[PDB]
Chain A
Amino acid sequence: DPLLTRTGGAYIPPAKLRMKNSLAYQRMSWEALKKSINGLINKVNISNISIIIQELLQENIVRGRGLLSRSVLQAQSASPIFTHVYAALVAIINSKFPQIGELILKRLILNFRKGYRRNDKQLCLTASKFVAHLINQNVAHEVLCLEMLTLLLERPTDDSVEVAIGFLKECGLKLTQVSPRGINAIFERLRNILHESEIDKRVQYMIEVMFAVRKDGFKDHPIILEGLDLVEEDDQFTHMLPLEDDYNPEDVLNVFKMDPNFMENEEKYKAIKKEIL
């Protein structure tokens, strides 16, 4: 905020604005790509995800993999109400470009850790919610959920328990299926907190809620909503990314830079596009 440089002036409508070359063209194409992605990410919802994917795939999302990752991550952070939809979108892209799903996951994990470190509850709540749904979508391995829950529950605070319980609600049904002993360990831990600890009303209530959810079999928290399970089981690529690893977010990929092999790299992508359509 006080660090980032300040660029003022009036917004100018595109219709109004329109009323060497290699660099100029790469920059222009870069700017159009960023805008196109931004629009698609704003548009995506359950009823239109397939068309959004098709329109997204027309763009060079390899060259713009950082741009796409950033747009999806910013969108989910501002609009966690659509987390399930962003997860499904990521799941489809990852099935075709696993390296892009991996880049999103790496940054999301780092985002969660930043939030935890800074005691930024909201960011912990939204980043964890995203993790849960990427797990639901088999984009990320459940070891990440288990490790985050253990971290949150080690020195339980009102905020740390809140994050953990909201998180377990979202990925719990999936957890139960792929790692019943793991989720059992989490519940035992919650049980020890509920009795073998000196807790306040807020913590006690959130835990009783979590046990209540498990008893009804997560009836209000299905793994994937009808309309979003769009990747065939065997076509998905499940990344095994632990919580603690020293991931490189590669945010430098978000910044425009002249590409000497721009020609080759461009023709390379269209060869990919024609493949998966």
Chain B
Amino acid sequence: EDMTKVEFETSEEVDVTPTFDTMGLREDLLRGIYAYGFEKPSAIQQRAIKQIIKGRDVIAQSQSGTGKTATFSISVLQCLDIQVRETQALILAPTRELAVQIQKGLLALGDYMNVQCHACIGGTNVGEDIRKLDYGQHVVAGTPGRVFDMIRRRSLRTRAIKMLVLDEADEMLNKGFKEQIYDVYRYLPPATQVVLISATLPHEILEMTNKFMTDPIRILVKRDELTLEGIKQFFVAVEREEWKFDTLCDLYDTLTITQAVIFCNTKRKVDWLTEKMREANFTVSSMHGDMPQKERESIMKEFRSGASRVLISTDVWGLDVPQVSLIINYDLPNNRELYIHRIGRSGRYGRKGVAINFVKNDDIRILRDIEQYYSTQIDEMPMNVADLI
């Protein structure tokens, strides 16, 4: 299935950390991370780790094998004060076997950190659990019931707890552990950070996040959906093709633009407009269908990096460009279905945006076609558009 292809979105804008060395991890942890075999962080990791370690409450959701276990294991270790011989993080899991598996993972990644971690066994080993907890373990993991018993017994001191991880939360709920989980949370310190990991988002989980969390970051599998909702769409009656470039230039003399994306219908127009803007001293990346997907992705990297402030493209892609201030449809697409793919919001958390359509009288009908087809509204651009960004 290649779980590396799984895409995520976040409920607010976040720093996307492409490498483990750009996450701001302590060095002895990084040593453990690389020593384990990690090279490149997964998509969930490039988003969730930074947010957890900086202290945010986090809900992370996706099917198995996207890197969720490493995500909370690494984050828990990062936040440990090894010099404090008291439990600082609690990890609840649906089974004892998974708790043990989690412990071993933590010990491996934390091997250069002198971390102490214990998975509560129970059974004929409850006495042994108690001994270890009394000694002091930085991290303790186990089922909600077992962990709750140790807290209630006072074997697991809670005063230094700063973190609570709910691993496979939906599964714990399915096993009937809801009460125990609320019971655990009720005995923890007021400012405790909570991280919830779950493949699914049923109501009990969302209510749980509402009760356990404060301004949580939601990091979820991206919804495969596009909409024009939230996109401010305008048109400018340019009347003639030959009037397009002057108008584009005037927009740049009147608007505040970080980066912009400009669509044209043809490779020919893209090549032409690129030459024209460059000659006008714009920094431009250009993209079209004649180039392999690898080139297009590399050029997108260059543009995202800020090497150019204008990206000019045919229909080859929605876009993900957080620094893009505006999308300009220099050409209106002959086909109506390409319109939303140019300017649409993808996912439930897709960025709001602004689109400016250049419309020739020649295109008067195609513009109207678009409006009808998506049942949307595209206003004539007002002079004070700069105020509306």
B256 is contacted by which of A10, A78, A206 (Cβ under 8 Å)?
A: A78
B250 touches A42 (CB 8 A): no
Cα of A206 to Cα of B78 in the assembled complex, Å:
12
The stretch of A44-52, A101-109, A110-118, A266-274 that contacts the partner chain: A44-52
Stretch of A12-20, A139-147, A149-157, A244-252 at the chain-chain interface: A12-20
The 0/1 profile, CB within 8 Å of B marked 1, for residues 200-225 of chain A is 11100110110010000000000000
Residues of A69-87 whose CB lies within 8 A of B: 74-75, 78-79, 81-82
A7 touches B384 (CB 8 A): yes
- In the assembled complex, the Cα of A66 lies from the Cα of B254 at a distance in Å of 16
Of B256, B380, B382, the residue contacting A74 (CB under 8 A) is: B256
Complex Cα spacing A193 to B65, Å: 40
Decide: A81 and B384 in contact? CB cutoff 8 A. Answer: no
B24 lies within 8 A of A209 (CB): yes
Question: Is A8 interfacial (CB 8 A cutoff)?
Answer: yes
Q: Are A51 and B24 interface neighbours, CB within 8 A?
A: no
Q: Is there contact, CB below 8 Å, between B243 and A15?
A: yes
Q: When A47-B307, A51-B281 are in contact, do A16 and B243 touch as well, CB less than 8 Å?
A: yes
Is the CB of B55 closer than 8 A to any CB of chain A?
yes
Contact: B238 with A43, CB < 8 Å?
no
Q: Which residue of B lies closest to A12 (CB)?
A: B383
Q: Which of A32-40, A90-98, A179-187, A229-237 contacts B (4 or more CB under 8 A)?
A: A32-40
The answer to whether A45 and B381 touch across the interface, beta carbons within 8 angstroms, is no
Given the known interface contacts A11-B381, A202-B55, the answer about A43 and B243 at a Cβ–Cβ threshold of 8 Å is no
Tell me, rounded to whole Å, the shortest Cβ–Cβ distance linking B152 to chain A. Answer: 26
A38/B253 in contact, CB under 8 A: yes
> Which of A47, A201, A206 is the most central at the interface, judged by chain B CB atoms within 10 Å of its CB?
A201
**In the bound complex, do residue A205 and residue B238 qualify as a contact, i.e. CB atoms below 8 Å apart?**
no
Contact assessment for A201 and B162 in the assembled complex, using a CB-CB cutoff below 8 Å: yes
Assess whether A48 is in contact with B236, with CB atoms less than 8 Å apart.
Answer: no
**Are A7 and B383 in contact, with the CB atoms below 8 A?**
yes
Cα-based distance from A12 to B307 in the complex (angstroms): 32
A11 touching B252 by the CB < 8 A rule? no
Q: Which residue on chain B has the smallest CB distance to residue A18?
A: B246
Would you give the shortest CB distance from B180 to chain A, in whole angstroms?
25
Instruction: Tell me whether A10 and B307 are in contact (CB under 8 A).
Output: no
Residues of the B chain whose Cβ atoms lie less than 8 Å from the Cβ of A48: 281, 283
Tell me whether A75 and B246 are in contact (CB under 8 A).
Answer: no
In the complex, A79→B54 CA distance in Å? 24
Contact of B55 among A12, A38, A45, A205 (CB under 8 A): A205
- A1 and B168 CA atoms in complex are apart in Å by 47
CB A81 to nearest CB in B, in angstroms, measures 6
Contacts A15-B243, A205-B55, A206-B54 given; indicate if A45 touches B258 (C-beta within 8 A): no
Q: Most B CB atoms within 10 A — which of A36, A43, A82?
A: A43
Known: A201-B162, A209-B24. A14 touches B309 (CB 8 A): no
Say if the beta carbon of B249 comes within 8 Å of chain A: yes
Residue of B nearest to A203 (CB): B55
| B254 pairs with A35, CB closer than 8 A | yes
Whether, in the assembled complex, A120 has its beta carbon less than 8 Å from a beta carbon of chain B, the answer is no
Bound state CA distance, A46 and B283, in angstroms? Answer: 9
CA distance A212 to B309 in the complex (A): 32
> Which of B162, B256, B380 neighbours the largest number of chain A CB atoms within 10 Å of its CB?
B256
A43 near B258: Cβ-Cβ < 8 Å: no
Is B100 an interface position by the 8 A CB rule? no
Contact A43 B252, beta carbon cutoff 8 Å? yes
- Interchain nearest-CB distance for A35 vs B (Å): 4
Residue from B246, B258, B259 within 8 A of A13 (CB atoms): B246
| A32, closest chain B residue (CB) | B253
Known contacts being A8-B383, A14-B246, is A43 close to B26, with CB within 8 Å? no
CA–CA, A224 to B167, complex, Å? 45
Of B24, B27, B191, B323, the most chain A CB neighbours within 10 A belong to B24
Docked Cα-Cα span, A201 to B283, in Å, equals 41
CB distance from B253 to the nearest CB of A (A): 4
A55 to B30, CA, bound (A): 48
Contact partner of B258 among A39, A51, A52, A78, CB < 8 A? Answer: A78
Partner of A43, one of B162, B236, B246, B283: B283
Contact A8 B384 (CB under 8 A): yes
Determine the chain A residues whose CB is within 8 A of the CB of B286 once the complex forms: none
Is B134 interfacial (CB 8 A cutoff)? Answer: no
Are B238 and A13 interface neighbours, CB within 8 A? yes
The answer on a CB contact under 8 Å between A45 and B308 is yes
Q: How far is the CA of A75 from the CA of B309 in the complex (A)?
A: 13
Nearest Cβ in chain A — how far from B49, in angstroms?
Answer: 12
CB distance from B79 to the nearest CB of A (A): 6
Bound-state Cα–Cα, A13 to B356, Å: 13
CB-CB < 8 A to B90: which residues of A?
Answer: none
Q: Which residues of B contact A260 (CB under 8 A)?
A: none
Are A43 and B281 also in contact (CB < 8 A) when A13-B238, A14-B250, A200-B191 are?
A: yes
Contacts of B238 in A (CB 8 A): 13, 15
Q: Smallest distance from the beta carbon of A118 to chain B beta carbons, Å? A: 20
**B247-A205 in contact (CB<8A):** no
Would you mind naming 22 contact pairs between A and B with Cβ atoms under 8 Å apart?
A7-B384, A9-B382, A10-B380, A11-B381, A13-B246, A15-B247, A39-B253, A42-B255, A43-B281, A45-B283, A45-B307, A45-B308, A47-B283, A47-B307, A75-B256, A78-B325, A81-B323, A82-B309, A200-B55, A201-B162, A201-B193, A205-B79
Binding site for B on A (CB under 8 A): 6-16, 35-36, 38-39, 42-43, 45-48, 51-52, 55, 74-75, 78-79, 81-82, 200-202, 205-206, 208-209, 212
